[PDB]
């Protein structure tokens, strides 16, 4: 019932599977088992997190299913579809957040202007 | 590549804010320089 938590931070995607508490969790991509491969170190399954570094959208996307230790890849019926961009030093916001930061700049500039004028007046 | 386009839009906004701040401070400075 608990959905996965996907955090895309630059050239790095983090997948967390919080439904199974504290059990050893292994990961599957398009019915291919990945995580702790001892090679191709850009993918790693430390703790609950699949940390995919340099996430190639054409080849590292698709299905992703976690399963606890002692549970088969074929009897876990809670799959995640992952499809994301890998733009370097690149994040996502709408007009709201840039309007928020420019409004914040307006507010601190006007407050500093009024405060400096009032302090120099007194 | 819409990411570079939107970054260009954001730094256009930043340069426009910089222009507004320097226009305001330079108007204030010339008002003082004709205000003794």
């Amino acid at each position: 019932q608990t959905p996965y938590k996907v955090s895309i931070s630059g050239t790095t995607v983090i997948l967390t599977c919080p439904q199974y508490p504290g059990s050893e969790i292994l990961w599957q991509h398009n019915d291919k088992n990945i995580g702790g491969d001892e090679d191709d170190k850009n993918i790693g399954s430390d703790e609950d997190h699949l940390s995919l570094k340099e996430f190639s959208e054409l080849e590292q996307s698709g299905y992703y299913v976690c399963y606890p230790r002692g549970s088969k890849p074929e009897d876990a019926n809670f799959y995640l579809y992952l499809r994301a961009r890998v733009c370097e030093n690149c994040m996502e916001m709408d007009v709201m957040s840039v309007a928020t930061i420019v409004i914040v700049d307006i507010c601190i500039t006007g407050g500093l202007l009024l405060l400096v004028y009032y302090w120099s007046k007194n | 590549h819409t990411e570079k386009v939107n970054m260009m839009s954001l730094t256009v906004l930043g340069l426009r804010m910089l222009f507004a701040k320097t226009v305001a401070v330079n108007f204030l400075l010339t008002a003082k320089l004709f205000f003794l």
Partner: peptide, 27 residues
């Protein structure tokens, strides 16, 4: 298409409070 309109709205806000000051000081 939106962010530049926010900057122009901010300059319009400055212009309209300046014009309000001019109107209050011209009477």
């Amino acid at each position: 298409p939106k962010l530049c309109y926010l900057l122009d709205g901010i300059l319009f806000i400055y212009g309209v409070i300046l014009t309000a000051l001019f109107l209050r000081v011209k009477f």
